[PDB]
Amino acid sequence: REHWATRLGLILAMAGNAVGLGNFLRFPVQAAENGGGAFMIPYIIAFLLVGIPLMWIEWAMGRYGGAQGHGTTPAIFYLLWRNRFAKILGVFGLWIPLVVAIYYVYIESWTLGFAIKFLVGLVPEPPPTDPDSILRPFKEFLYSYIGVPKGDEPILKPSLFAYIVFLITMFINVSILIRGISKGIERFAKIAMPTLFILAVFLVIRVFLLETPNGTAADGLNFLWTPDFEKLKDPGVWIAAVGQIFFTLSLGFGAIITYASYVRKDQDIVLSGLTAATLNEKAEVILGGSISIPAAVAFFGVANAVAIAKAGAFNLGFITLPAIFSQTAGGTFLGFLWFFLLFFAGLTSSIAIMQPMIAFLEDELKLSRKHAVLWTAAIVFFSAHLVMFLNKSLDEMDFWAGTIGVVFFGLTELIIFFWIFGADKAWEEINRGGIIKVPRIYYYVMRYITPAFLAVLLVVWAREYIPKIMEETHWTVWITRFYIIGLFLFLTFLVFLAERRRNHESAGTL
């Protein structure tokens, strides 16, 4: 099996897996949408009771599977629980990352497209101080790029440039993946993460200098870091907080597990896993939290900034920040740096959610890396047309796979590893080779707290939220549901074929 070459390479690759669009785009919206500081308490608690423990569990499962030549859940779940149903539940470890990649790579391509256009100055000329007259040009810019519906039909019409950029983006992802783990993903991470960190720090500094008659960046930080102990009682904020923790740490996507399957069997995963997790959190709360929110608040005040985030999820990152920057000297270039940052953050994460499918095809169906990467790219490219042309398809996929799916899968993997496989066998597997041991209290958290926490969350989700999504959405949501259910069927068929190949190969081993 391929293995990460260096400890630094491993850490930066895992850090790049985690640090992405979730840190700079998703986090600000979730926080601004849920009261800022009021969102942070449940967030921090979720990180301690869910994020950290699950991270160690996934690293352990991955390393454990990798030692036997398996990097994905269909096989790993079976290793931990030799029951056919383990293989079926394992399919989610291929389905979730594939479905997320199908829309994630497209959003990533928008950042490359914007970066290009901002670099060459093909951007809107706002007018020369009425907020709408300032934001409208940028809103139109985004809307024309992705092709937002102007009429009643739920159809999107992406610009030709956007389509071509998606193609280029897919090519770039392929160029990294086709070189493999050490010479591809690891090598790239050593270049991308330093760049990402530097660009992000620079942007924070520039945003911190923003002052207007409406406020300063400081007012933004105060909004995000001031506790509101009176929301701690709202399930919605908790659901939002936990969902963000999963998404931002790449947990429940089968991605951490696959990356860890390339860690040598003897290697530490305790300190490594904790470091990757802490690195992501710093990038999220310190860097991602200090850019778009402070900027929006400084220029429009808290009440307006919040209204902006609630009106549209991509407003802050793709419309508001660039609009604000355009009001300052060299703003178009700052816009370029912002989208360039988002692109690298996205690229390092998208290669992480495509690798599971690649690992499955290599490990279980024995395809060459070249063929595994190309077929995976073809499936994602083809499937992405649904997200590019059908309005709200992206939201549907992000919900089923990227939101509820990951929480369900996180609970599932914990049960299979800590309950079925054996809590003591699991605890032993996690700590084996650790540079540091996992704090003892966490054994009780993993075995009782985490699963109980998630179980309650999921029940509240299915009872007071999932019905509205099943009853109040446009009929076209069924087009997406149908297609992704088909993808699950297809992946299950591939796992069935891997079974038969194994049987064929065994009866050849006799």
Ligand X SMILES: CC(C)C[C@H](N)C(=O)O
Ligand Y SMILES: CNCCCN1c2ccccc2CCc2ccccc21
CB-nearer residue toward ligand BOG: 109 or 348: 109
Give me the residue label for tokens 């499962």.
61
Beta-bridged to residue 390, according to DSSP, are 155
Cβ proximity of 181 and 3 under 8 Å = yes
Choose the binding region for ligand BOG from 22-30, 156-164, 217-225, 453-461 (rule: CB under 6 A): 156-164
Q: Diameter of the chain by CA atoms?
A: 80
Per-position DSSP letters for 361-427, written without gaps between them:
HHHTT---HHHHHHHHHHHHHHHHHHHHHBTTHHHHHHHIIIIIIHHHHHHHHHIIIIIIS-HHHHH
User: Does 248 participate in binding ligand X (rule CB under 6 A)?
Assistant: yes
Residue 161 found at the interface with ligand BOG (CB under 6 A)? yes
Is the CB of residue 22 less than 8 Å from the CB of residue 284?
Answer: yes
- Which of 314, 375, 419, 465 binds ligand Y (CB under 6 A)? It is 314
* Partner whose binding site includes residue 348, from Na ion, ligand X, ligand BOG, none (CB under 5 to 8 Å by kind): Na ion
Nearer to ligand BOG, 163 or 375 (CB): 163
Provide the 8-state DSSP code for 229: T
The distance of closest approach from Cβ of residue 141 to ligand Y in the complex, given in angstroms and rounded to an integer, is 17
Q: Does residue 175 bind ligand Y (CB under 6 A)?
A: yes
Kindly tell me which of 20 and 335 has the beta carbon lying closer to ligand X: 20
Single-letter amino acid, residue 168: I
- Beta carbons of 260 and 58 less than 8 angstroms apart: yes
Q: Rule CB under 6 A: is residue 356 a binding residue for ligand X?
A: no
Sign of CA dihedral 136, 138, 139, 145: positive
The least CB distance from residue 315 to ligand X, in Å, is: 18
CA pair distance 370, 9, nearest whole angstrom? 22
Q: Is 84 annotated as a binding residue?
A: yes
- Interface residues with Na ion (CB under 5 A) are 16, 18-20, 22-23, 248, 280, 345, 348-349
**Amino acid in position 62:** G
Q: Provide, rounded to whole angstroms, the least separation between the CB of residue 162 and ligand BOG.
A: 7
DSSP-derived letter for residue 155 is B
Q: Does 18 bind ligand X (CB under 6 A)?
A: yes
Please choose which of ligand X, ligand BOG, Na ion, none residue 16 contacts, taking the beta carbon within 5 to 8 angstroms, the exact cut-off set by kind.
Na ion
Binding mask 327-366 toward ligand Y (x if CB under 6 A, else -) reads: ----------------------------------------
> Which span (18-26, 380-388, 395-403, 485-493) binds ligand BOG, by CB under 6 A?
380-388
The residues that bridge with 216 in the sheet, in sequence order, are 211
Which 92-111 positions form the footprint of ligand X (CB under 6 A)? 100
Nearer to ligand BOG, 54 or 181 (CB): 54
Virtual torsion, Cα 375, 378, 380, 381, nearest 10 deg: 170
CA distance 103 to 345: 15
Tell me the site size for ligand X, rule CB under 6 A. Answer: 15
Q: Which partner from the list Na ion, ligand X, ligand Y, none does 29 bind, CB cut-off 5 to 8 Å by kind?
A: ligand Y
Tally of residues, the chain: 510
According to CB under 6 A, which one of 123, 291, 351, 353 is a site residue for ligand X? 353
- What is the radius of gyration, based on Cα positions, of the chain? 22
Count how many Cα atoms sit within 13 Å of the Cα of residue 103 in the half-sphere of its side chain: 22
Cβ(73)–Cβ(410) below 8 Å? no
Q: Which residues bind ligand Y (CB under 6 A)?
A: 21, 25-26, 29-30, 104, 107, 172, 175-176, 179, 184, 187-188, 191, 313-314, 395, 398
Indicate the annotated binding residues for phosphocholine. 84
Q: Which residues bind ligand BOG (CB under 6 A)?
A: 48-49, 116, 155, 157-158, 160-161, 163-164, 382, 385-386, 389-390, 439-441, 445, 479
Q: Which residues bind ligand X (CB under 6 A)?
A: 17-18, 20-23, 100, 247-248, 250, 253, 255, 349, 352-353
